[PDB]
């Protein structure tokens with residue numbers, strides 16, 4: 439009971455629900471993003487969470503070692519590793535910013551208050567631009583000294599020192615902590631509720647605009663955010679569930695996890711939009727013109743909310759300590775999963791583990807050094823747009839198609855019944871077989887066909903930036919066909935002989951050899 443309670447609480451609050459969710463909610467309107475989020479969640483987030491839990495718990499192997507049930511579909515074990523590496527590249531800049539803010543918040547006069555600092559412009563408006571946004575973009579990022587993604591400039595030494603500290607802390611780390619976010623968020627929520635002009639920001643939150651529901655960006659954003667929040671599509675759920683006993687049940691875990699995650703996301707968006715409405719009322723501007731729909735929205739929103747609070751310095755220190763802890767936890771989880779999977783896959787990198795871990799850490803630091811330069815927000819935006827999205831949805835769709843069609847929904851249900859004593863009902867089987875793959879395929883095709891170039895406020899990325907982004911997405915996406923070709927060419931025999939062992943499970947060896955392959959009959963495919 440205590441261990442199970444602490445298990446659900448751990449996944450409840452993370453960097454996805456605190457940082458990315460309000461950004462994507464403000465970008466898409468507020469309710470026109472809430473509707474697709476719930477629609478995609480209740481349909482294809484719980485079934486995939488349950489499927490990943492059961493697969494990991496039964497196979498008792500890592501992200502790549504599970505695929506002995508469909509030997510040809512193993513490139514999705516390296517696709518997820520590449521995706522996690524790409525995410526971890528830009529996942530450290532958030533922690534560097536948090537460290538910078540925590541260090542700079544150790545004073546009696548906060549710097550994001552008034553328009554008298556050396557990093558200000560004649561456009562600054564004290565109750566143009568706000569002092570908090572001007573501080574973030576001109577005294578921390580120094581974005582005004584870069585023309586665009588073409589003109590980056592040398593890295594800054596302060597953010598480089600913060601990055602080095604983050605890297606060493608992560609490497610050496612790789613009751614009180616688990617309850618600080620709840621208290622801090624409750625204080626912020628109460629303060630935002632009891633503020634003038636918050637009702638407008640709440641009305642703008644709980645109101646659906648049908649004109650944006652006919653687009654595609656909001657559907658793609660909701661689909662990607664569901665996977666980012668729940669944790670599916672990264673290969674960490676399978677690795678974690680590899681040690682989840684055998685008799686532990688998975689549907690009860692999935693239901694509670696999904697419910698708590700949804701509640702936390704809703705509360706975070708509520709707080710952010712309430713403060714947005716207050717500031718819009720204060721500055722005599724509409725809610726849609728307060729700030730830019732960029733990744734650094736919380737770093738502009740939250741300093742002002744702390745400033746409107748008594749004893750603002752202590753609250754600032756506590757908030758940024760909490761943010762640093764959350765980022766460290768998420769980064770540790772991702773890097774641990776990547777390293778463990780790579781070590782397990784190759785038996786050569788087992789006598790040399792510390793060297794491999796040091797090499798991975800060094801490479802991640804070197805490739806994350808690109809976002810510390812003057813124009814690093816452009817590289818951050820490009821990575822955020824292109825590392826996840828089409829690649830993660832493609833990997834999730836391939837995993838679902840494999841596990842369901844190529845293996846057997848009935849066989850998966852029989853395995854689950856053997857594991858836990860209860861065979862899944864018709865809702866789960868139908869969702870695994872038909873409902874989820876169709877909605878994933880539609881989203882993938884829509885995302886691929888539609889253009890949607892990235893931008894940062896008013897900067898428009900050139901053609902070569904989009905080409906590079908598509909290159910780095912395709913690099914992760916294209917691990918399935920190459921492994922399929924290698925596996926097909928490695929097996930011996932003829933076309934039928936190779937195809938028999940390429941798709942049948944490794945537990946089916948004694949039966950495929952004696953002229954009996956289950957995947958060669960219509961009844962196997964036509965069953966739900």
Ligand SMILES: CN1[C@@H]2CC[C@H]1C[C@@H](OC(c1ccccc1)c1ccccc1)C2
Nearest residue numbers: 448449451452669672674767768771772
């Ligand atoms: C990209 N990774 C990040 C966030 C999503 C995916 C999953 C991974 O898991 C974390 C985690 C922490 C809190 C909430 C949700 C996920 C994790 C940390 C420590 C130990 C295990 C897992 C971290």
Ligand SMILES: *[C@@H]1O[C@H](CO)[C@@H](O)[C@H](O)[C@H]1NC(C)=O
Nearest residue numbers: 552553554555556557558564
């Ligand atoms: C702003 O800065 C100037 C010069 O640093 C200083 O003299 C002044 O007192 C500050 N405040 C106002 C309200 O001008």
Ligand SMILES: *[C@@H]1O[C@H](CO)[C@@H](O)[C@H](O)[C@H]1NC(C)=O
Nearest residue numbers: 558559560561562566567582
């Ligand atoms: C400041 O405002 C003026 C318009 O009054 C605008 O032309 C200029 O580009 C602004 N400066 C910056 C750095 O955005």
